[PDB]
Amino acid sequence: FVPESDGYFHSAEHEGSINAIMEEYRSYFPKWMCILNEGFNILLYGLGSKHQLLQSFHREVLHKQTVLVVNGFFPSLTIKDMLDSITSDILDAGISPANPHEAVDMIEEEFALIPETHLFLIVHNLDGAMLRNVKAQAILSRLARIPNIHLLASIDHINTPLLWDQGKLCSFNFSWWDCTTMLPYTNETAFENSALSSMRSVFSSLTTNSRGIYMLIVKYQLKNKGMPFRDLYSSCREAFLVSSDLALRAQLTEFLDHKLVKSKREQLTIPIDGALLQQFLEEQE
Amino acid sequence: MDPTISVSKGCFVYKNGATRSLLGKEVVQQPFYEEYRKAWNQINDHIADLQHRSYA
Amino acid sequence: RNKYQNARRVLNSAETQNLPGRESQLQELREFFSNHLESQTSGSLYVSGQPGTGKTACLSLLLRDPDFSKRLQRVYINCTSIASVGAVYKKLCTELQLKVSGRTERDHLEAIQRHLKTAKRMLLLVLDEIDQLCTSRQEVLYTIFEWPALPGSRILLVGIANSLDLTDRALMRLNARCELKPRLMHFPPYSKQQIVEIFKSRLAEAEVLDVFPPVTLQLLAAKVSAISGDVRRALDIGRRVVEIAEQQKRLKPVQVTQVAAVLNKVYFPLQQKLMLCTLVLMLRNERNKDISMGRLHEVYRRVCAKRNILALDQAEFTGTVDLVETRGILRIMRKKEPRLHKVLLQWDEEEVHAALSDKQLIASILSDTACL
Amino acid sequence: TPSQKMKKIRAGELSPSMQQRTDLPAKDSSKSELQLAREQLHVSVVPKSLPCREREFENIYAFLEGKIQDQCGGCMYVSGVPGTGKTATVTGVIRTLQRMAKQNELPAFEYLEINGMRLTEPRQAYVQIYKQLTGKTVSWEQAHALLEKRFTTPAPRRVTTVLLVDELDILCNRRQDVVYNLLDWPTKSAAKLVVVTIANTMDLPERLLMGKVTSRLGLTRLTFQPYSHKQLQEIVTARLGGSETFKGEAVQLVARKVAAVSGDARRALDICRRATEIADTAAVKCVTMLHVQQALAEMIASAKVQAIRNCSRMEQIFLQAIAAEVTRTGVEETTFMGVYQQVETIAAFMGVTFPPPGRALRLCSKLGAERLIISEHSRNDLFQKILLNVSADDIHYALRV
DNA sequence: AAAAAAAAAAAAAAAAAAAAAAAAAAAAAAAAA
DNA sequence: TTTTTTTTTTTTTTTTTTTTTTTTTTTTTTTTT
Ligand SMILES: Nc1ncnc2c1ncn2[C@@H]1O[C@H](COP(=O)(O)OP(=O)(O)OP(=O)(O)O)[C@@H](O)[C@H]1O
Ligand SMILES: Nc1ncnc2c1ncn2[C@@H]1O[C@H](COP(=O)(O)OP(=O)(O)OP(=O)(O)O)[C@@H](O)[C@H]1O
Ligand SMILES: [Mg+2]
Ligand SMILES: [Mg+2]
């Protein structure tokens, strides 16, 4: 691949094809066991989702082994979870220490005492949302250096070796494999890291006084095409909509709770264009 | 979907007899594995001996 | 003894057996529990509403209903009475008489997960005030709301809360799968006629209906449904009416004037006057609302110099500003030094001028622009 | 072993008594009239019938008598600035109801009290309530579980329990679980709990309490307004009684100068005691108005003129230079370098020499320790920021006149 | 291209969560009889 | 062999440190002139 630098300076048959692709990639599994036996690690870097390929490798080959499957695309994953998992559930040694490199030192000292006890770990999306810092990659490369622990991992981002220096890349004794399936990213992109109807459904649950307050806000916003706090308080006090100022601050905090009006510095700007506010103002009549 | 696509956890332990030589016997007793083991151990011991004689 | 005390007894703002305002909601929950008992499928449910709308009353009524006592096993958990967010599992084992190896939360979690797979009876798990289980990562709430997706589990769980969009803000990832999405149910706040029917039911419960004419019930219910709409405020004002009528008259029915005075009730030192007058003057004659304590005290000293009043020093002025902040008129942003505290007025100037009731003084302060 | 002592302390078996005097205390026959007026004017000697708080007494007594006789339980919130007789009125209502319960004119009740400022954590509230039913000191989880079993499970014959919560805003935290548990237990039918909560801020339930907690707190409120000068005069005149150790205008002067500042009753009762101790030294049997003016000058102090008058020469030159630099550049926060330039100007005008900057930092540290100015650490010399904590007219009054 | 608002980001204070330490309690080993 | 004492390990409770939330202030970007 050669990217041209000047652009920076000027700035059916598909299913059977994927089935044949997956059978071709399932042919590579005894070669992967022979490669993992000699001390290398497996890294896959194709285009499509390599989740199902690694899961079928775990089911069809590593069925009786100690396998820690780590979902790197999980947005609430931490290194504390993986290290607590290795020290507690596999090795029965309780909670790992709060220093994670000390926990990896403990894991090396404990796996030195048990030869012919191999921990496999399968990390879908090694460049995941909580493994893109340098410390987590240092911990994973220190884990991959142990002769008992073997590693399979997926790579999806385009800037992945920007955080692997040559020490991490010699610890990660990788065998790079082009496992390019064409499967879409359903399981990887579903999580938390990746309207006027909502405004009407929130306005359905309002009471009468809050309805009058938001009516005053939208009427002033559409008359003058944000609004101040003092004129709003005088408008709510002239219509007997409120008892004090702090009840207006409570109702405006309730409005900001539901993302209906936006406070600024107190400026009150409704973050939806004027035309849909005009349709909403004509909706009540 | 899958058993390992849980919304709560991120890690899944499949411990089978873990406490506090990956291949079978049918591949190791093949002669190319023994020959590769002997040749690689010879080359690695020679490279280690050369590095020792360099660093001593 | 008399009838005002009997109304004061029977309004009571406490747990009741008959729920006249909640008749479609109880039937909807009954249809939910019946459709998940007869099909023997699991399900999540999230009820939400304003504080005082009758959610806990509906679910506490259905958890004593004998038609569901035989088919399913009911467990109620209030999430404010738990010592920690990760401790709820232990409490659930305590609510299920489970036998755990114990002494770690993961053991209680695996005991619950072993119980939910081979249970002899369907479980109904109600978690009240579930917003206390929200944390940074929310491992506990996502573990609890995933037990419908457990293999072979028959747990069905209800979560009661206040915000309408808790499962859309703090439980977004459950929207990734259509199975794990909790069915929403909003309890609307009470209207006027529902509060009138609640009052008439509670007054006919002890035959004290003669004490309240219908017009005070309609006026009070219209006011409560206009402001807040919850029945706790309705029963509180309906009890304060009879507890002012009993102390005032000591059989005369409660007229519209007394409930009007109660609804207008529900819905000064000299140096504090000179502090508030100086703050009103400095907010009028300057567009900068960043007023410190020393900058306010330096103008206050000139103001009391012009009135021939011995002004306080800084040490007593700070306590004066705090004693006015206790009324809610001000707000003090605290800093490292007491000279640098920031006084922010939170009342309108008409409200300050009305609360002082000293027009001949504040008319003289605002005419004294030269001491600024 | 002292572990038996701690085992009996946590179980409440040995009472926490205190050491006693080797001398018997004095008799009331050997005291003078001024000593008796000084003993009656102590703030700790609370009277049986409080003046000026009769309507609040009627309000709290009507609420508590109704909640006890109806056997229901509920909640009240009284509030007001400190010194306005909140806790004294509430505990007087409790003592009157206990006197009526000892004479079979009322159903019996158990009265518990906690203070939010005598706890280190709000969760320790659970340790204190359970220490007032049984007397055992347990962990807060076990105490909360036992209180929950007591108030949720119905058991005849349960008696009404009146729970007083002083300083409610110290029990409020980010989660608000202690205050929600204390305001949710009366809402259950099996608990005969009446919670009366006392605090200072009037808008506390809407300011920092959540919607369910202010929903359970209720609308039956009471506000203890500050005392006017007639009310402070009536308080102090009722404290003195039938004596003539105070003048009729001295009490009025204390009342007018205290009711204009805070409205506190502790302030008037302490200023009158200081006036009594001043009159005891001047060998007069009465407390005239001059002793009251001397006590009002001493207790309502303003000693930032005498501090600048008692500074040294270079410190007063430094105080002139900070004000001159504030006048020159306009801004209030001035660095040390411009202040030292103005120091050189003022010292060359006065004809005296000044210390080097290393000792001018010592003068600045001395003035900043006394809080006449606000200064930083002296590690960043010549660039540390100086605020003038005293007003600029106070220096020009203290040094000219 | 500058003046002025405005949203994003950093600093800092404050409260909670987690780790660590210390004490209480229960189980085990060794002496008393 | 059975009972009582002293050691050891586990579990609970309290303290301290680290992280997280929340408020404030700055600060670089965007709109208007
Ligand atoms: N439909 C009704 N009819 C009569 N009384 C009712 C009704 N709904 C609620 N109540 C009264 O309101 C109280 C129960 O309110 P509930 O606790 O259900 O509100 P909530 O929404 O749970 O409040 P929060 O959200 O603050 O917990 C009981 O005292 C009950 O007597
Ligand atoms: N009306 C009164 N008559 C006589 N003495 C009074 C009166 N009001 C207050 N005092 C005296 O002033 C003191 C006020 O103490 P109290 O505990 O009542 O104040 P408080 O309002 O509870 O203060 P805080 O809010 O700070 O706790 C009491 O010790 C009492 O002796
Ligand atoms: Mg409830
Ligand atoms: Mg008090």
Method underlying the structure: cryo-EM
Q: What are the helix and strand counts (H, E) for chain A?
A: 14, 7
Which string of DSSP letters, residue by residue, matches A35-54?
HHHTT-EEEE--SS--HHHH
Residue C269 to residue D218, Cβ atoms within 8 A: no
The rounded distance, in Å, linking the Cα atoms of A42 and A174 is 6
Q: Round to whole Å and give the CA distance between D283 and D279.
A: 7
Contacts of C188 in chain A (CB under 8 A): 205
Residue A203's nearest CA partner among A191, A215, A194, A187 is A215
Neighbours of C350 (CB within 10 A): 11
Which of A192, A205, A243 has the CB atom closest to C186's CB atom?
A205
Query: Distance between CA atoms of D111 and D308, rounded to whole angstroms?
Result: 54
Contact status, residue A271 vs residue A221, Cβ threshold 8 Å: no
Cβ C57 under 6 angstroms from ligand 1: yes
Cβ-based contacts of C165 with chain A (< 8 Å) = 202, 258
Q: Which residues 6+ apart lie within 8 Å of B25 measured at CB?
A: none
C-alpha to C-alpha distance for C198 and C122, rounded to whole angstroms: 34
| Strand order across the C183-187 sheet | C72-78, C122-128, C155-161, C43-49, C183-187
- CA-CA distance, C259 to A158, in Å (whole number)? 71
Final residue of a structural domain among C136, C167, C187: C187
Three-state SS string over D244-275 comes to: CCECHHHHHHHHHHHHCCCCCHHHHHHHHHHH
**Residue D304, token pair as written in the block:** 């930032």
> Strand D334-335 relative to strand D109-115: parallel, antiparallel, unpaired?
unpaired
**Are A190 and C173 inside 8 Å of each other by CB?**
yes
- Looking at the DSSP assignment, which residues form a beta bridge with residue D163? D112, D195
CA dist C260 and C248 (Å) reads 15
Best probe of the A interface among B14, B25, B33, B44, by most A CBs < 10 A, is B14
Alpha carbon distance A262, A199 (integer Å):
13
Measured distance CA(D271)–CA(D274) in Å, rounded? 5
Alpha-carbon torsion angle C293, C297, C303, C308, nearest 10: 150
User: Ligand 1: which atom is nearest the Cα of residue C187?
Assistant: 21
Q: C173, C142 in Cβ contact below 8 A? A: yes
- Could you say which ligand is closest to the alpha carbon of residue C49? 1
Q: Is residue C140 part of a domain?
A: yes
Do A55 and B4 make contact, defined as CB atoms within 8 angstroms? yes
Rounded Cα distance, C273 and A18, in Å? 82
Please name which of D252, D256, D257, D251 lies closest in space to residue D273, comparing C-alpha atoms. D251
Q: How far is CA D115 from CA B17, D12, D136, in A?
A: 56, 20, 18
| SS3 of residue A26 by DSSP | helix
DSSP H helices in C121-230? 139-144, 166-169, 192-204, 214-227
Cis peptide before C8 (omega within 30 of 0): no
- Helix or strand holding residue A250 (H, E): helix A245-257
Closest C-alpha to C159, from C59, C87, C74: C59
Residue C303 lies in a domain: yes
Strand A174-177 versus strand A150-154 pairing type: unpaired
- Mark yes or no for CB contact B10/A117 under 8 Å: no
Distance in angstroms (rounded) separating the CA atoms of residues C239 and C222 = 16
> Which residue gives the smallest C-alpha to C1' distance to E7?
A264
Nearest in space to D280 (alpha carbons), one of D295, D300, D265: D295
**Short-list D166, D187, D188, D178, CA closest to D140:** D178
8 A C-beta contact, residue D322 and residue D388: yes
Residue where the block lists tokens 């700790």: D44
Residue type, B36: Y
- D141 and chain C in contact, CB less than 8 A: yes
Please give the Cα distance from A29 to D44 (Å, whole number): 87
| Cα–Cα dist C141/C154, whole Å | 18
CB pairs under 8 A between B and C: 15
Distances (CA, A) of C355 to A185, C59, C347, C351, C352: 64, 46, 10, 6, 5
Query: Residue C300's closest chain D neighbor by CA?
Result: D391
CATH code at position C289: 1.10.10.10
D47 lines ligand 2 (CB under 6 A): yes
Euclidean distance between CA atoms A78 and A96, whole angstroms: 13
Question: Is C274 found in the same domain as C183?
Answer: no
What does the block give as tokens for A22?
A: 């997956």
CA angle, residues C129, C94, C46, in degrees to nearest 5: 25
- D230-235 CB contacts, 8 Å cutoff, 24+ apart: D230/D255, D231/D51, D231/D52, D231/D255, D231/D259, D232/D258, D232/D259, D232/D263, D232/D265, D232/D268, D234/D51, D234/D52, D235/D51, D235/D52, D235/D265, D235/D268, D235/D269
**Residue A164, SS3 per DSSP:** coil
**Which of C187, C205, C229 is the last residue before a domain boundary?**
C187
Decide: A175 and A35 in contact? Cβ < 8 Å. Answer: yes
User: Using the 8-state DSSP alphabet, how is residue D159 labeled?
Assistant: P
State CA A107 to chain mean position distance: 27
Touching subunits for chain D (3+ Cβ pairs under 8 A): A, C
A97 strand E contact, CB < 7 Å: yes
State the chains in contact with B (3 or more Cβ–Cβ pairs under 8 Å). Answer: A, C
Pairing of strands C122-128, C155-161: parallel
Q: Ramachandran region of residue D136, left (φ > 0), alpha (ψ -120 to 50) or beta?
A: beta
Å from the A156 CA to the F11 C1': 46
Beta strand pairing status for A262-264 and A174-177? unpaired
Give the end of a domain, one of C140, C159, C187. C187
Length of chain D: 401
Specify whether C182 is located in the same domain as C279: no
3-state helix/strand/coil string of A81-133: HHHHHHHHHHCCCCCCCCCHHHHHHHHHHHHCCCCCCCEEEEEECCCCCCCCC
Q: Which token pair is D51?
A: 């003046």
Looking at the fold, whether C181 and C282 belong to one and the same domain comes out as: no
Query: Count of CB atoms within 10 A of residue C194's CB?
Result: 21
**D193 phi and psi angles, rounded to 5 deg:** -110, 130
Cα C22–chain centre separation: 20
Q: Are residues C72 and C168 in the same domain?
A: yes
Read off the tokens for C239: 């009890």
Could you tell me whether strands D221-223 and D373-374 are parallel, antiparallel, or unpaired per DSSP bridges? unpaired
Here the contacts of A165-173 (C-beta below 8 Å, separation 24 or greater) are: A167/A141, A168/A137, A168/A138, A168/A141, A171/A141, A171/A142, A171/A144, A171/A145, A172/A41, A172/A43, A172/A140, A172/A141, A172/A144, A173/A39, A173/A40, A173/A41, A173/A144, A173/A145
Asked whether residue C218 is domain-assigned, the answer is: no
Q: Give the CA C168 to C1' F25 distance in Å.
A: 32
CB D81 within 8 A of CB D263: yes
- Of all protein residues, the one whose alpha carbon is nearest to atom 23 of ligand 2 is D82
Q: Is C319 annotated as a binding residue?
A: no
**Per the annotation, does C294 bind a ligand?**
no
Residue C5 lies in a domain: no
Structure tokens at C88: 């709820």
| C chain contacts of residue B7, beta-carbon cutoff 8 Å | 142, 145-146, 173-174, 176-177, 180
d(CA C62, CA C36): 15
D160-166 vs D109-115, strand pairing mode: parallel
Q: Is C109 a member of any domain?
A: yes
Q: Confirm if D378 and D364 have CB atoms less than 8 A apart.
A: yes
CA-nearest residue to C178 within chain B is: B1
Cα–Cα dist D37/C14, whole Å: 51
Q: Is residue C167 part of a domain?
A: yes
Would you say B5 and A187 are in contact if contact means Cβ atoms under 8 Å apart? yes
- The total domain count for chain C is 2
What are B's interface residues with A at a Cβ cutoff of 8 A?
A: 1-2, 4-5, 9-23, 27
CA atoms of D69 and D107, how far apart (whole Å): 7
- Please report residues of B whose CB lies closer than 8 A to that of A67: 14
- Report the distance separating Cα C107 and Cα A252, nearest Å: 45
The protein residue whose alpha carbon is closest to atom 9 in ligand 1 is C54
State the best of C208, C239, C296, C341 to mutate against chain D, taking most chain D CBs within 10 Å: C239
Residue C318 lies in a domain: yes
Residue with tokens 């330039």: D341
φ and ψ at residue D332, rounded to 5 degrees? -85, -35
**Cβ neighbours, 10 Å, residue C189:** 24
Contact A243 C267 (CB under 8 A): yes
The response to whether D191 counts as a known ligand-binding position is no
At residue D156, the 3 state secondary structure works out as coil
Contacts of C337 (CB under 8 A, 6+ apart): D374, D387, D389
Say which of C142, C176, C177 has its CB closest to residue B8.
C142
Distance CA D218, CA D354 (A): 67
Instruction: From the CA of D231, give the closest atom in ligand 2.
Output: 1
Which residues is B13 bridged to in the sheet?
A: A68
Residue type (1 letter), A185 = Y
- Closest among C320, C303, C311, C317 to C364, alpha carbons compared: C303
Long-range CB contacts (< 8 A, 24+ apart) of C97-103?
A: none
Please give the C-alpha separations between residue C93 and each of C102, C123, C128, in angstroms, as whole numbers: 10, 13, 17
C183 and C290 belong to one structural domain = no
C55: Cβ below 6 Å to ligand 1?
Answer: yes
Q: Which residues contact D186 (CB under 8 A, 6 or more apart)?
A: D73, D74, D75, D193, D194, D195, D216
Helix (H) or strand (E) holding D160: strand D160-166
Q: Does D206 touch chain A (CB under 8 A)?
A: yes
Q: Which atom of ligand 1 approaches the CA of C13 most closely? A: 29
Counting from 1 in the atom list of ligand 1, the atom nearest the Cα of C21 is 1
User: Tokens at residue D257, please?
Assistant: 């100068």
CA gap C91, A148 in Å, rounded: 40
What is the sign of the dihedral through the CA atoms of D241, D246, D249 and D254?
negative
Q: What's this structure's resolution in Å?
A: 3.2
Please report where in the chains the tokens 């801020």 appear, as a residue.
Answer: D201
- Tokens 């994670």 sit on residue: A100
Residue D311, token pair as written in the block: 């500074």
Pairing of the two strands A66-71 and A119-124:
parallel
Q: Is A150 helix (H, G, I), strand (E, B) or coil?
A: strand
Write phi, then psi, for D312 (nearest 5 degrees): -80, -170
C87 Cβ nearer than 7 Å to chain F strand: no
| Distance between CA atoms of residues D301 and D306, nearest Å | 11
Residue D214 parent element (H or E): helix D211-217
User: Phi and psi for A139 in degrees, rounded to 5?
Assistant: -65, -40
Question: 3-state class of C313 per DSSP?
Answer: coil
- Rounded to an integer, what distance in angstroms lies between the CA atom of residue D57 and that of residue D90? 8
Query: Does residue C342 reach within 7 angstroms of strand F, measured from its CB?
Result: yes
Contact residues on chain C for A209, CB-CB shorter than 8 A: 226-227
Tell me the β-bridge partners of A151. A121
Rounded to the nearest angstrom, the minimum Cα separation between B28 and chain C is 41
Instruction: Give me the domain span that covers residue C145.
Output: 23-187
The tally of CA atoms less than 13 A away on the side-chain side of residue A222 is 17
**Does a structural domain hold residue C213?**
no
Q: Is A243 left (phi over 0), alpha (psi -120 to 50) or beta?
A: alpha
Cβ-based contacts of A68 with chain B (< 8 Å): 11-14
Residue D173: CB less than 7 A from any atom in strand F? no
Residues C126, C129, C130, C133: is their CA dihedral positive or negative? negative
Sheet with D373-374, edge to edge strand ranges: D334-335, D385-388, D373-374
Verify C-B touch: 3 or more CB pairs within 8 A: yes
- Closest among C124, C176, C178, C179 to C155, alpha carbons compared: C124
Cα gap D223→D86, rounded to integer Å: 9
Determine which helix (DSSP H) or strand (DSSP E) holds D115, and give its type and residue range.
strand D109-115
**Which of D214, D234, D227 shows the shortest CA–CA distance to D265?**
D227
Across the interface, of C15, C301, C325, the residue whose CB is closest to D391 is: C301
A191, A192, A208 member nearest C226 (Cβ): A208
Cα dihedral across residues C348, C349, C354, C356: positive or negative: positive
Tell me which nucleotides of strand E come within 7 A of a protein CB.
6-7, 13-20, 24
DSSP per residue, D43-104: TT---SS-TT-HHHHHHHHHHHHHHHHTT--EEEEEE-STTSSHHHHHHHHHHHHHHHHHTT
Ligand nearest to the CA of C48: 1
Question: What angle, 0 to 180 degrees and rounded to 10, lies between the N-to-C axes of helices A229-238 and A245-257?
Answer: 110
Could you give the CA distance from residue C42 to residue C36 in angstroms, rounded to a whole number? Answer: 6
| C85 is near strand E: CB distance < 7 Å | yes
CB contact under 8 A, D187 and C243: no
- In this structure, what DSSP letter does residue C332 have? E
Among D40, D53, D57, D84, the mutation site with the greatest number of ligand 2 atoms within 8 A of its Cβ is: D84
**Distance in angstroms (rounded) separating the CA atoms of residues A212 and C227:** 11
User: C342-343 and C291-292 as β-strands: parallel, antiparallel, unpaired?
Assistant: antiparallel
Find the Å distance, CA of residue A264 to C1' of nucleotide F25.
Answer: 14
Q: Is A262 helix (H, G, I), strand (E, B) or coil?
A: strand
